[PDB]
Amino acid sequence: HMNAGWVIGVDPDTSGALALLKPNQPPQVFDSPHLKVLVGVRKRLDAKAIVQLLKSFEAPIGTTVYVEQSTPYPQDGKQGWWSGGFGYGMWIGILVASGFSVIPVPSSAWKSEFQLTKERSNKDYSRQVASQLFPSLSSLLKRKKDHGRAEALLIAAYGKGIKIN
Amino acid sequence: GWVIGVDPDTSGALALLKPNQPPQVFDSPHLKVLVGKGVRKRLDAKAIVQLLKSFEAPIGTTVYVEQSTPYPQDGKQGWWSGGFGYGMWIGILVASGFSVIPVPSSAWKSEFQLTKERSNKDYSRQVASQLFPSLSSLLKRKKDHGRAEALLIAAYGKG
DNA sequence: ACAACAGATGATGGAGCT
DNA sequence: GCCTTGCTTGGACATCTT
DNA sequence: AGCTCCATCAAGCAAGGC
DNA sequence: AAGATGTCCATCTGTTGT
Ligand SMILES: [Mg+2]
Ligand SMILES: [Mg+2]
C-alpha cells in the first residue's frame, strides 16, 4: 500500500544531503554535516551532528529512509572507494541504530523515474528537475554545488512513490 | 568504568570489559548481500544494535575502534569494505550514545611489544590468551584473529 | 574565501631530527 | 560440510540477446 | 612548523585437506 | 538461464574566477 508516513532521502556522499518530506507540509533539505579531519586535511561526515540533525526531526519510529546505494568506477582512486564505503556505511549505521527503516536505492532506479538519460543528463538537469517538483526550495538549488541537495530531494520523491507494507 | 574494543572488519569482533565480571568477546554478526555476480558478507547493523543494547552499558561508555588503513597494493573493493565497516561501526556507536575513540593497529604495540620480525602469524592470539585466560578456549583457531584483536584493542583502551 | 573547473584516480601513522 | 593456504588486489546494475 | 625513514594491514576467491 | 551490452557515478588535488 501507498506510503502515507514520513519519507526521507539520503545522498550519502561527503558533499551530500538529506531531504525530509512530511505529508501536507513543505519539503525540507539539509546539507550533510562534515569535519576537517587530519589524514593533511579532508572532509568526513560528522556522525555526531548527523544524529543530532536526525534527533531534531523527531520523526516516528520506523520512518522509511531511502539511501542512495552508489558504486564507484574501476578507474576511481582507492581513496575514493574507501570514502564511498564510509559514508554509506555510516549512514546505514546511524539510521538503523536510530530506529529508521532503511531502503538502499540503486542510483539507476531514481534517475529512471525522472527520465534522466544520457540526453538531458542528471548532472546537468537533476537540480532543475528537483526545482520544479519542489518550487518552495528552488532558492537552495540555484548552484552547481547544490547537486547533492537535489539528489536527496529526488531520492525522497522516488521513495515516496514506492508502495510499502 | 566499562571498556569495549572493536575490530571493525567483516570477520572482526567486539570485546567487552566490565568491572567485577569476567571479560567477553563476540563475533561480529554478518549477513550475506548480493553484489554483482556472487555474494558478499557485510556487517548486519540490525544485529549489532541488538548486541550493544543487550550489554546495558552505562551512557556514553568509551569504545575504542581499530582504524582501517589499507595498503596501496590492496584492491579497490577492499578499500571500500574497509571504509564501510569502519563507518558503520562508528555510525551505530555514536547514534547509540557511546563515546568513540579511533585507535591505530600499531597503538597496542606501544603497551605490548610487537615487531615485523617474529610477525603475528599467530602472535596476537597468544598475547590475548595470556591477558584473558578466561577466553583461551575461543582463541585456539587461526580464524580467531579478530577476537584476539578486539580483546587487545580493549586492553589498550583500558590501559 | 567561496565557486566552478580540470585532471588523475592517489597510503597512513609515528618516531626522530632540522 | 569447515578450516587453512595460496594468490591477486578485482565494478554494479539494468537491459537486450541467445 | 617542516622532512627524512619505517612499520602497519586487509578483502576476495579459487583449490586442498579434513 | 546465462552472456554480451550499455549506462551510469565519485574522490582528491590543484587552478582559475568571481
Ligand atoms: Mg551520489
Ligand atoms: Mg585487524
Residue numbers in the entry:
A (entry chain A): 106 to 144, 147 to 272
B (entry chain B): 110 to 268
The authors write:
After tedious trials, we finally determined two crystal structures of the NtMOC1-HJ complex at an approximately 2.5 Å resolution in the P21212 space group. One of the structures contains the active NtMOC1 and HJ with a noncognate CATG core sequence, and the other is composed of a cleavage-inactive NtMOC1 mutant (D116A/E175A/D253A/E258A) and an HJ with a cognate CCGG core sequence. Here, we use the complex structure of NtMOC1-HJ with a CATG core sequence as a representative to demonstrate the catalytic and binding features. NtMOC1 in the complex also exhibits dimerization, and the HJ is embedded into the cleft of the dimeric NtMOC1. In the HJ-bound complex structure, HJ exhibits an open planar and X-shaped conformation with an overall two-fold symmetry. The center of the junction is opened by NtMOC1 into a parallelogram with cross dimensions of 32 Å between the non-exchanging strands and 9 Å between the exchanging strands. The scissile phosphates are in close proximity to the two active sites of the dimeric enzyme. Four acidic amino acids, namely D116, D118, E175, and E258, coordinate a magnesium ion approach to the cleavable phosphodiester backbone, constituting the catalytic tetrad. More importantly, D183 specifically recognizes the cytosine (C9) via a hydrogen bond. The pairing of D183 (protomer A) to the cytosine (C9, from strand F) led to flipping out of the initially paired guanine (G10, from strand D) from the duplex.
